Amino acid sequence: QISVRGLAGVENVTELKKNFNRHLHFTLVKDRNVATPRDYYFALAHTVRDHLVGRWIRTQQHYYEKDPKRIYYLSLEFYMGRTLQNTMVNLALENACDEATYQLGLDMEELEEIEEDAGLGNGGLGRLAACFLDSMATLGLAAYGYGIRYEFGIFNQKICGGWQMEEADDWLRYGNPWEKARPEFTLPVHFYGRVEHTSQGAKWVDTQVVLAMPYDTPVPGYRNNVVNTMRLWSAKAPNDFNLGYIQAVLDRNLAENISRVLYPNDNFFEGKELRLKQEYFVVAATLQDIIRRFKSSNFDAFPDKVAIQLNDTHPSLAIPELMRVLVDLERLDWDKAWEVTVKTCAYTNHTVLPEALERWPVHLLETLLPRHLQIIYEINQRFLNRVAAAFPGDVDRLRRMSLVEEGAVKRINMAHLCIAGSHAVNGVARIHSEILKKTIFKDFYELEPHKFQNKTNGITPRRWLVLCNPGLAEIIAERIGEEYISDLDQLRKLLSYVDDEAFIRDVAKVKQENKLKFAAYLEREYKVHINPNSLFDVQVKRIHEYKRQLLNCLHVITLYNRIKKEPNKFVVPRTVMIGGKAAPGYHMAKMIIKLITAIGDVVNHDPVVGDRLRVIFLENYRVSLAEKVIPAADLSEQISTAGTEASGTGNMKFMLNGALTIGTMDGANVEMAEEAGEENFFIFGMRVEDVDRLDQRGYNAQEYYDRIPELRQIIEQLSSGFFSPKQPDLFKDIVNMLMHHDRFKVFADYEEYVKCQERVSALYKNPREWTRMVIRNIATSGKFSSDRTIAQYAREIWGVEPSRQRLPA
Amino acid sequence: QISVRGLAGVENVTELKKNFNRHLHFTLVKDRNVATPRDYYFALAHTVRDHLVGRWIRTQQHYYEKDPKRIYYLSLEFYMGRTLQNTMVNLALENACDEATYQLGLDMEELEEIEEDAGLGNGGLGRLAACFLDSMATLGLAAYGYGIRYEFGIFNQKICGGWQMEEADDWLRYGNPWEKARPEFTLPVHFYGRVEHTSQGAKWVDTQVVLAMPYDTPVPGYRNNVVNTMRLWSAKAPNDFNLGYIQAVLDRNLAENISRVLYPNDNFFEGKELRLKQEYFVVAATLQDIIRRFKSSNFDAFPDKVAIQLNDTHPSLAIPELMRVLVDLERLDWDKAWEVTVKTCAYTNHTVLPEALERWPVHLLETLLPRHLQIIYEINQRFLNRVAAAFPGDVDRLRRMSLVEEGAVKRINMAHLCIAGSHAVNGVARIHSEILKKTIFKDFYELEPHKFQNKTNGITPRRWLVLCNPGLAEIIAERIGEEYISDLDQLRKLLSYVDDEAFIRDVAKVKQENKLKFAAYLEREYKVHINPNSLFDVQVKRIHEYKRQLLNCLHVITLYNRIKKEPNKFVVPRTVMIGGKAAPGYHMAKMIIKLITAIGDVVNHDPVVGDRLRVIFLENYRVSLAEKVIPAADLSEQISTAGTEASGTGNMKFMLNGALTIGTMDGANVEMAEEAGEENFFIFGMRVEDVDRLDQRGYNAQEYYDRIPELRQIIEQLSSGFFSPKQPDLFKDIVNMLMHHDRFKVFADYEEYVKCQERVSALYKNPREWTRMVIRNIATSGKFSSDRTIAQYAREIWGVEPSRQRLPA
Numbered sequence A, B: 001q002i003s004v005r006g007l008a009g010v011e012n013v014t015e016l017k018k019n020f021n022r023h024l025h026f027t028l029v030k031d032r033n034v035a036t037p038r039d040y041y042f043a044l045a046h047t048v049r050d051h052l053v054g055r056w057i058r059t060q061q062h063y064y065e066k067d068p069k070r071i072y073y074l075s076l077e078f079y080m081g082r083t084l085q086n087t088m089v090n091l092a093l094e095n096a097c098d099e100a101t102y103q104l105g106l107d108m109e110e111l112e113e114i115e116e117d118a119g120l121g122n123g124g125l126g127r128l129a130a131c132f133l134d135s136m137a138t139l140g141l142a143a144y145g146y147g148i149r150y151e152f153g154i155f156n157q158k159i160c161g162g163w164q165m166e167e168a169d170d171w172l173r174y175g176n177p178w179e180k181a182r183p184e185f186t187l188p189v190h191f192y193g194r195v196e197h198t199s200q201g202a203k204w205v206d207t208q209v210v211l212a213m214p215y216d217t218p219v220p221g222y223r224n225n226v227v228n229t230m231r232l233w234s235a236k237a238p239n240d241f242n243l244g245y246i247q248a249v250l251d252r253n254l255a256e257n258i259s260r261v262l263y264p265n266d267n268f269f270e271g272k273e274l275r276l277k278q279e280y281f282v283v284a285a286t287l288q289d290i291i292r293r294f295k296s297s298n299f300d301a302f303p304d305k306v307a308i309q310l311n312d313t314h315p316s317l318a319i320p321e322l323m324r325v326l327v328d329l330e331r332l333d334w335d336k337a338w339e340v341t342v343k344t345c346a347y348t349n350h351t352v353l354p355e356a357l358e359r360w361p362v363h364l365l366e367t368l369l370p371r372h373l374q375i376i377y378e379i380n381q382r383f384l385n386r387v388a389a390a391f392p393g394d395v396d397r398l399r400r401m402s403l404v405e406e407g408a409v410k411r412i413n414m415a416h417l418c419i420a421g422s423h424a425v426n427g428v429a430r431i432h433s434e435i436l437k438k439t440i441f442k443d444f445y446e447l448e449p450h451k452f453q454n455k456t457n458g459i460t461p462r463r464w465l466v467l468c469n470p471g472l473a474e475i476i477a478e479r480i481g482e483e484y485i486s487d488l489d490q491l492r493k494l495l496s497y498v499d500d501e502a503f504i505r506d507v508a509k510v511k512q513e514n515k516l517k518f519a520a521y522l523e524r525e526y527k528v529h530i531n532p533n534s535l536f537d538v539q540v541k542r543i544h545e546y547k548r549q550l551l552n553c554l555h556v557i558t559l560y561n562r563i564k565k566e567p568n569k570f571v572v573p574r575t576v577m578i579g580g581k582a583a584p585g586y587h588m589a590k591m592i593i594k595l596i597t598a599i600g601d602v603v604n605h606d607p608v609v610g611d612r613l614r615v616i617f618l619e620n621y622r623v624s625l626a627e628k629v630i631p632a633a634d635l636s637e638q639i640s641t642a643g644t645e646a647s648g649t650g651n652m653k654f655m656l657n658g659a660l661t662i663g664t665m666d667g668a669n670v671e672m673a674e675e676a677g678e679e680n681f682f683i684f685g686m687r688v689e690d691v692d693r694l695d696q697r698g699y700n701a702q703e704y705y706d707r708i709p710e711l712r713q714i715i716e717q718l719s720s721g722f723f724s725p726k727q728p729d730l731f732k733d734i735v736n737m738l739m740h741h742d743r744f745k746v747f748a749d750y751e752e753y754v755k756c757q758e759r760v761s762a763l764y765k766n767p768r769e770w771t772r773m774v775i776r777n778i779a780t781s782g783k784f785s786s787d788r789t790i791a792q793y794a795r796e797i798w799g800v801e802p803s804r805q806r807l808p809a
């Protein structure tokens, strides 16, 4: 059909069809008379998996022969989404499979929809890991993703009576054809026990053993024939475990609970034992595997052969674990073991919000990991000795920098552990990296300025353009070729097309087609009727106070009130779509979801409004829904309070896909506006400096309420029960937070947000100028490719050279 | 190599090799450089599975088209063992695979050893189910095995310090290539709740739902291209289940515990709730599936299209369940629903031992299955009304026959439910069936004499001859052809060879080869050194008081004492091998294992004994060990107290494989001796009538102890600590039971057992006459083919005609 989807050759097609029918018969044990669409999906998945195998075997082979430095990306989260379409894209099989399936009388797009998302992450951090794996494969790095194969990923979200309800995400019920179990590489992980000191060193004894069984998933690079590995551990009980009889067998569950379920908190730390178990489990199994590989190539060369990247502090125990192995098992002296550890490990920080910081109570570590605690204290002592020598007399510095926090309960600051034990610490956007150096890690920065770097986040243009937006991919490719898909900076060439009538027509056409398709998807799957001619105003991301969905709610209510005041006046019609999950125990986040739906109930059913204003809560926001809605968006809402959103990646996805951004100077928004030019971005609100000025004098929300009549009216509607006539006090908690306890200064930005929203509507009245600005955005979106990010990691942290050379087929 | 293993054609072999290499690459994702023997096993398993698929699809297809009466064998146990070799045998692929693997440089026999047993049963009952599936497929019956896919089968048995230790049988760790998950046929099963009565009948409401997900395993018939289905249910939680968050997900375990583990009791009832859950779970899912199939062909024709065979009372709830569906859901009147139920259901009884009888407390049924209880009471009332009309005034009869037993706790007699709700009740050997009519079911028999039948047990000559003893299979086939493998009566033709010098030579040679192979297997796997020239005296079966392993121990100790008395006298050398599992909570059974090993410690280490007497406990007796040891045996020990062993099947396996039997007139032993002639069997001990005479006057063990000096010496050795020098009182419980509380009258049979054992040794001194008697045994073993058994079931219970006609390939 379209060119970027590749060739459908006669041979190729015939072959895919034969293999499809072979899998249906032999793999699925079905004839064409009893097969369901699910069987068909499975037959196709196996057929495509077949094309990976040789490449996967050869790539792993090639790494053994060449022995390059290996990158180990340790994450508790990999937010992969669906694998089928991504695999086809990367193997150039898409058109061939479309053709092959078509000829069997099947719609490939209908089959694609049957695949469960691998929702093994919460949000930005987990998706960053996924984009990274794609880029690392595309850049020919010998890189391995290591995590946990959770039986249950992020919960499926249902709305009932406007409230979020959580359901178990049983993504493995029907089987996963993409993974290969490797039981022969099963490893023991130890817990509990106690430490004996002997003649020749400390001994960790009387432990409980859980086994870690690995599952490997192929990670194909873009058309280079590279297939890297994602290795995820599953917990299994040993067979002597517990071993009246029945109960002992049933108690095997206790041990396997470790890999059972993803904790569904985004930027929130919950200090539960099961969570620490997961953190140690992935670290212990991963490090044994790393060391085993290494010895099949003296520890002096370890950092020349191994890089370990820590995705947040979740795998911070890799630092004490590597020490434990080097010192207790391999019998290296402390100082050498330490040198090796620091040169191997690097730490990526993802947020400055205090409630996200991992601070583990000591009593927990004491019981579960007694040896690791001793090692942590030893690290703390030696670290503080270095600090005291550098800053003699500065006792306050000593307590601020300690890995151990005194207080009610003593805790370990895992972020402090990470900085101490890493040769590099990076934030995830320039402004975030600056804030790390100015504020929370200032002391660490003054001690070791060389450790601190920036690596601005990115997204893969494979999933986030070619895959989800083939029509845009194609019109770009018509003008400038296909090379940009693995070299996104090439999009700058689109700037010479900003005054091309045909290209303007194409850009707008693709946007319109995307909106029609999405509007249809809404009606089919969720019986809702949206005007496709309206401006699509979308905020999709986890529900959070800092992300300020509430600010969007205030704008929505304002438009509503303006319409009612003057019903017979023109306004640019909008569909406001808001979507995301709240963490199950985050009450405020759950109230915001309810507020959103309650506004919809009023707005969507008002006859005077008509199709001028629609408010839709998009249920079950996940990767596969992002792929649908992001291409359909006109306006991206990126409206976190300045200094709170470390980077964001949603922002970049929308820039790439032809939406304009309304946002604060926060996270990568600053770099996006810099790349596109401020005149091509809808910037509003306090800067970082403004927020600090307001904090110095104190944030009084009442001042805003007293001075802005439009705002007062909204707060009164909320309070009086305009939005909740049966429970008039439903939203008392919300009004109250906004008036008395708003950490995120919603009111402070309200006035500038509304004015800036008026400028958006004004530009939308002028399609040509809208589209011209869109082009300026897409054309400058190159920096935000994860290819750029990973090449920066490779060169400035890992000490490896990326490559775009094909392995042989 | 050998003829019964089939042709290895050039095409066949080439083809298997291609498919083997295809699976290694594509299925297992391995090159020949990294593959382990386990990978090789898996590649072969997939390759053989491929040959089943078309046949499986066509057979299921054929049953839909022809719509024959369907047989549903409901068992909580299917003791399948390994599948690979059995599949090859039934598809005639064995030599071809041997050749194909050989050419790849692999030993097929080494690969076969890597397969886990599917140990989804305890002993006789579970193995009977497996043999039946084989026969039903071989006789072209449209038959389905229905059970539970336990995650853990019968525990792996280790001996430590002579004691049994249990380990979890994690048979699914590496995957099962033989099963196909069918998630699309998932069904709800309900538990708990309460009953509302309405205008239109009773309604079971507020239930908890567990899902039943089926896994299908192919059951190939012998060379007829028939492949039937074994469908096993796995328990899965619904996704709204429990749905703070984490705990709700972790609690999904509660529901899935149902299919987690096989209860390891043989002929023992344990009234645990989890066990009742399993019983209902398999019944509820099975019946929905049966009815669904039926409606895709009015309930008047149900029994013309459906037979349900109940393997013991374990699935007795099928009777109230079928009523519940017919009455509550389908709205049939009681009497019609009942007629349908009786005409559909048939009950096989497996034992008369009182501790095996399922008697479920009412409070348990009340809570878990309140509707089923009401239906059971309704059945009871109507049944007792029929009894009162037939036997007016006989109040005692009424209480004896009640389905409900009064007492401490009220209980339901599930066996009574089965007789009431079945058109046929069979025992499992002639003498057992007679005892059912004379004793425990006399009342039921007097009411409905037409219900009571015999169906003498059998074993499949595929697994139990061709597969485990190819060398015997071959020399038989040399004289009489291959037809006997599916028509075992043909073995009678061997009687014309009883005076053939060559055939005598062959029989003895094969026995000798089997003993060499087994003796080697002992050294390799368990570092033990046995004289292959000795008589192999084997007792393999579950450890039980009724099976009288202790009687064997007494004989062993007697030979020991005789040798010591007169060291310099000739005795026929013996290896006594005893093996089997004790139920984990059966203290006595566990003490017997320890006694066995303690005798070995004394006997095997006595220099004066030499290699004249060896005592070996065979660890982890299971199906795949039976396949090795049974062909190697000279003497089969079948020595249960008369009237206790309903049938036995071990007895038949050994008769088929060239061992002579020493046994009591118990179970099928009576029919075996009748088939072979008593002169060709070593019969000893009390008959049934003798046991009854002894019970009438009282069993005084002391009388035996006082009159038999040889016996007194043994009891004194036991007591004084001859066998346990460090714990002198170790065996106090055993001496005590033997002296004061022996239900099984070990002493009563001791004297006759020893004399009869002397006759065995005497015949063994004469190889030619030994072998001639062996031939008379093999030659008359035809009746004990499960083909005979199933043809009897088909004709006299199910109302279907067996067939030996090939389906097209």
Ligand SMILES: O=c1cc(-c2ccc(F)cc2)oc2cc(O)cc(O)c12
Residues within 6 Å of the ligand: A265, A266, A267, A268, A353, A355, A356, A545, A546, A583, A584, A585, A586, A587
């Ligand atoms: O997931 C959560 C996130 C947040 C949060 C608040 C404010 C920030 F700035 C950042 C995160 O708070 C919580 C409070 C709870 O009691 C339970 C929760 O699950 C959360």
Ligand SMILES: O=c1cc(-c2ccc(F)cc2)oc2cc(O)cc(O)c12
Residues within 6 Å of the ligand: B265, B266, B267, B268, B353, B355, B356, B545, B546, B583, B584, B585, B586, B587
């Ligand atoms: O598995 C068992 C079998 C028997 C048994 C005894 C005598 C017979 F005649 C038959 C069976 O007794 C038991 C007693 C227990 O306390 C626990 C057990 O697990 C068992």
